[PDB]
Motif scaffolding. Structure first.
Motif, mmCIF file in Angstrom:
data_model
loop_
_atom_site.group_PDB
_atom_site.id
_atom_site.type_symbol
_atom_site.label_atom_id
_atom_site.label_comp_id
_atom_site.label_asym_id
_atom_site.label_seq_id
_atom_site.Cartn_x
_atom_site.Cartn_y
_atom_site.Cartn_z
ATOM 1 N N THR A 48 0.828 -1.200 0.000
ATOM 2 C CA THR A 48 0.000 0.000 0.000
ATOM 3 C C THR A 48 0.867 1.256 0.000
ATOM 4 O OG1 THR A 48 -0.180 0.166 2.416
ATOM 5 C CG2 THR A 48 -1.760 -1.253 1.284
ATOM 6 N N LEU A 49 1.753 1.360 0.989
ATOM 7 C CA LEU A 49 2.687 2.472 1.099
ATOM 8 C C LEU A 49 4.042 2.160 0.467
ATOM 9 C CD1 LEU A 49 2.345 5.319 2.390
ATOM 10 C CD2 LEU A 49 3.576 4.451 4.393
ATOM 11 N N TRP A 50 4.147 1.051 -0.272
ATOM 12 C CA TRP A 50 5.407 0.694 -0.913
ATOM 13 C C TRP A 50 5.812 1.686 -1.994
ATOM 14 N N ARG A 51 4.856 2.433 -2.552
ATOM 15 C CA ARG A 51 5.195 3.447 -3.546
ATOM 16 C C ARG A 51 6.045 4.553 -2.936
ATOM 17 N NH1 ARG A 51 3.592 4.259 -9.190
ATOM 18 N NH2 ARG A 51 1.397 3.874 -8.646
ATOM 19 N N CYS A 52 5.690 5.002 -1.729
ATOM 20 C CA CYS A 52 6.432 6.088 -1.098
ATOM 21 C C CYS A 52 7.863 5.670 -0.783
ATOM 22 C CB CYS A 52 5.712 6.546 0.171
ATOM 23 N N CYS A 53 8.061 4.417 -0.370
ATOM 24 C CA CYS A 53 9.415 3.946 -0.094
ATOM 25 C C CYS A 53 10.206 3.742 -1.381
ATOM 26 C CB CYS A 53 9.366 2.655 0.722
ATOM 27 N N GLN A 54 9.564 3.194 -2.418
ATOM 28 C CA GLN A 54 10.254 2.993 -3.690
ATOM 29 C C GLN A 54 10.583 4.321 -4.363
ATOM 30 N N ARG A 55 9.678 5.300 -4.267
ATOM 31 C CA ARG A 55 9.912 6.594 -4.899
ATOM 32 C C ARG A 55 11.037 7.360 -4.215
ATOM 33 N N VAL A 56 11.160 7.225 -2.895
ATOM 34 C CA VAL A 56 12.180 7.958 -2.154
ATOM 35 C C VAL A 56 13.543 7.294 -2.305
ATOM 36 C CG1 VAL A 56 12.940 8.571 0.167
ATOM 37 C CG2 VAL A 56 10.599 9.053 -0.545
ATOM 38 N N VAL A 57 13.589 5.960 -2.253
ATOM 39 C CA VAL A 57 14.866 5.262 -2.347
ATOM 40 C C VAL A 57 15.515 5.468 -3.708
ATOM 41 C CG1 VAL A 57 14.032 3.043 -3.216
ATOM 42 C CG2 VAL A 57 16.004 3.117 -1.659
ATOM 43 N N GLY A 58 14.738 5.861 -4.722
ATOM 44 C CA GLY A 58 15.328 6.185 -6.007
ATOM 45 C C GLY A 58 16.141 7.462 -5.995
ATOM 46 N N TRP A 59 15.891 8.344 -5.026
ATOM 47 C CA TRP A 59 16.637 9.586 -4.872
ATOM 48 C C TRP A 59 17.923 9.413 -4.078
ATOM 49 C CZ3 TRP A 59 15.343 13.617 -7.763
ATOM 50 C CH2 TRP A 59 14.021 13.747 -8.205
ATOM 51 N N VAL A 60 18.167 8.222 -3.525
ATOM 52 C CA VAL A 60 19.386 8.005 -2.741
ATOM 53 C C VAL A 60 20.644 8.210 -3.569
ATOM 54 C CG1 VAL A 60 20.626 6.358 -1.305
ATOM 55 C CG2 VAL A 60 18.139 6.532 -1.134
ATOM 56 N N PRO A 61 20.779 7.665 -4.785
ATOM 57 C CA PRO A 61 21.977 7.974 -5.582
ATOM 58 C C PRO A 61 22.110 9.450 -5.919
ATOM 59 C CG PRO A 61 20.879 6.024 -6.429
ATOM 60 C CD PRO A 61 19.938 6.650 -5.454
ATOM 61 N N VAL A 62 20.995 10.172 -6.044
ATOM 62 C CA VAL A 62 21.068 11.603 -6.328
ATOM 63 C C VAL A 62 21.582 12.359 -5.110
ATOM 64 C CG1 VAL A 62 19.754 13.636 -7.004
ATOM 65 C CG2 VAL A 62 19.244 11.420 -8.046
ATOM 66 N N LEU A 63 21.037 12.051 -3.929
ATOM 67 C CA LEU A 63 21.510 12.694 -2.707
ATOM 68 C C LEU A 63 22.961 12.340 -2.413
ATOM 69 C CD1 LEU A 63 18.396 12.310 -0.364
ATOM 70 C CD2 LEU A 63 19.101 14.296 -1.715
ATOM 71 N N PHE A 64 23.392 11.133 -2.784
ATOM 72 C CA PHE A 64 24.784 10.748 -2.575
ATOM 73 C C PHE A 64 25.717 11.584 -3.441
ATOM 74 C CE2 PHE A 64 28.481 8.157 -3.756
ATOM 75 C CZ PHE A 64 29.021 7.911 -2.510
ATOM 76 N N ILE A 65 25.448 11.644 -4.748
ATOM 77 C CA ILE A 65 26.259 12.470 -5.638
ATOM 78 C C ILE A 65 26.204 13.929 -5.208
ATOM 79 C CG2 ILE A 65 26.570 13.224 -8.024
ATOM 80 C CD1 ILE A 65 27.424 10.378 -7.546
ATOM 81 N N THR A 66 25.032 14.390 -4.764
ATOM 82 C CA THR A 66 24.896 15.774 -4.320
ATOM 83 C C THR A 66 25.810 16.073 -3.137
ATOM 84 O OG1 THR A 66 22.604 15.809 -5.094
ATOM 85 C CG2 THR A 66 23.274 17.517 -3.536
#
Ligand SMILES: Nc1ncnc2c1ncn2[C@@H]1O[C@H](COP(=O)(O)OP(=O)(O)O)[C@@H](OP(=O)(O)O)[C@H]1O
Ligand SMILES: CCCCCCCCCCCCCCCC(=O)O
Ligand SMILES: CCCCCCCCCCCCCCCC(=O)O
Ligand SMILES: [Zn+2]
Ligand SMILES: [Zn+2]
Ligand SMILES: [Zn+2]
Ligand SMILES: [Zn+2]
Lengths: 292, 294
Positions: free
Chosen positions: A1-19
């Motif tokens: 049900t809430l798996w979309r919010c976790c999947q959508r946020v974890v996709g930004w982890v490589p972006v925040l890392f490079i940032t």
């Protein structure tokens, strides 16, 4: 049900890392190297020159990186989608021979010059559309991407027809950003190891600066030289693994228009926009000129 | 109380200059560099102008910020009259014995100047003994060490702490305008002779040259004045009324030579000469003298 919010946020982890690494680089180069090291050496002339040049490369780097992330990939036009009447006829029929007769009748009203490996019309069951040429579906984006190249995980977006020139400029200014750091830290990277400069926190950052900058240069340089051939041959990364099949058979250069005109398909005719992360690619992504 | 009103209305000249500078950043970057110069297929000049402009713009806003928010230095607590001395001073009614009270305290302080009447320089409002080169400002409501003048365009006083920043503010103001005028000139020619006819860019490019040139002509006169003052080791007040020493009035009583006078403001380290970072020598409460005093 809430798996979309976790999947959508974890996709930004490589972006925040490079940032983070980029923000750390801005701190390490400006503060630790230019203010604590070069300015602590009474070299006001060299300090100012490096600071100006760094901000030029840093701006062109962050500008290209930003455009590569947030440029949404173009999707197929509404003309390619199956109408609600035609979609029913496809899902109702059970014979794969009559299924192709439905797709072929609509596709011949569309600028399509490629087929699948089995001489069938390229069709996407999930999107319920007929894939334009060079367009492919991405399970990460869950959508069809015009002139799709690959889904780069280090940005939270897909590299497609809209992203391609930005992605190339991002790679370009990434080597220039890293090369400029390594070439300037080098003369002082010699110092910290041989104990000419002994600052505590400046040693940790300058050493890490040279290591990280040099590592990214050798890593991205392989990717940059890879795409330089792809642009000249007018082949996406996907097409470099499976050549598109045309009406006259498979052709690896079916979209090639010569080396000069191929670069103009990505960067455009306006020379002033070649180095700037501003959209100047020719065509619309739903149809492409053919060699024949 | 109108002290609260003065504090708010005092930011109007600062907010005004801020608008002109922000407007200049828009007109030069957007209207001049992006709409005009980049529209002329001159990618080389556009990048050079944008990079050079950001260099001048950064050094300009940095000096202006430091000139505004650097609080002016006040006299130390040793200069203030002690509560014991304040009562004996308020008790006495003879102005001759009043000076004997101030003279007793001043001889324990590094004071080498007096008023024009050879009396101890004393501030009734602050109830302190004025250090050398220090003057009281009713706008700041405080004594300012090595006070030069109260500039309203920064809403601050130009004193011992502000001076080098104020000088650098004047310096980078001329260069900012000179760079704007020298680069907009070639395009200022076009809009008048109808080579470029853009509606919005015409208003900004024309106003850019006028405003930049009109600020250059004003500040250059002010900048050349202080370059002489620094070489003479004279504040603006001292350049109008010579300080009175033990041996009489002397216009060069604080002069230590042209070379050592600049070093009093900018310091010995050349790297800090052009940067808005405090590099002034001394403490503002005492200054070296031309004679044997200090
Ligand atoms: N209330 C004031 N507010 C701001 N400046 C003042 C004030 N009163 C005097 N000044 C200025 O600061 C100087 C004042 O000298 P005074 O001896 O009268 O008092 P001071 O202790 O404040 O210096 C004057 O400079 P001048 O030689 O050109 O006349 C004057 O311009
Ligand atoms: C010290 C800071 C250095 C920063 C160096 C820039 C970072 C370069 C990152 C390259 C990302 C390349 C994206 C390709 C994605 C993929 O593998 O498909
Ligand atoms: C487009 C050009 C914009 C440039 C604006 C520069 C503004 C310079 C302001 C100079 C203030 C000088 C302080 C004078 C103080 C005083 O003696 O009253
Ligand atoms: Zn799809
Ligand atoms: Zn994707
Ligand atoms: Zn004042
Ligand atoms: Zn006072």
């Amino acid at each position: 049900t809430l798996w979309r919010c976790c999947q959508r946020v974890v996709g930004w982890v490589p972006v925040l890392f490079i940032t983070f690494v980029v923000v750390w680089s801005y701190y390490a180069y400006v503060v630790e190297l230019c203010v604590f090291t070069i300015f602590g050496n009474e070299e006001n002339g060299k300090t100012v020159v490096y600071l100006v040049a760094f901000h030029l490369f840093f701006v062109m780097f962050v500008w290209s990186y930003w455009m590569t992330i947030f440029t949404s990939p173009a999707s197929p036009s509404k003309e390619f989608y199956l109408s609600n009447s035609e979609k029913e006829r496809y899902e109702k029929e059970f014979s794969q021979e009559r299924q192709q007769e439905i797709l072929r009748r609509a596709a011949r009203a569309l600028p399509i010059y490629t087929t699948s490996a089995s001489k069938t019309i390229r069709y996407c069951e999930k999107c319920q559309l007929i894939k334009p040429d060079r367009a492919h579906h991405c399970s990460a984006c869950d959508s069809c991407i015009l002139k799709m190249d690959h889904h780069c995980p280090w940005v939270n977006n897909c590299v497609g027809f809209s992203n391609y020139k930005f992605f190339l400029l991002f790679l370009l200014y990434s080597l220039l950003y890293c090369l400029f750091v390594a070439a300037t830290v080098l003369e002082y990277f010699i110092k910290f190891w041989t104990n000419e400069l002994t600052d505590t926190r400046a040693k940790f950052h300058v050493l890490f600066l040279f290591f990280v900058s040099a590592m990214f240069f050798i890593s991205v340089l392989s990717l940059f030289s890879y795409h330089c051939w792809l642009v000249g041959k007018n082949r996406t990364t996907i097409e470099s693994f499976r050549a598109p099949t045309f009406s006259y058979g498979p052709d690896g250069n079916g979209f090639s228009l010569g080396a000069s005109k191929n670069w103009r398909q990505v960067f455009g005719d306006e020379k002033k926009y070649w180095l700037l992360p501003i959209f100047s690619s020719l065509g619309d992504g739903c149809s492409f000129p053919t060699r024949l």
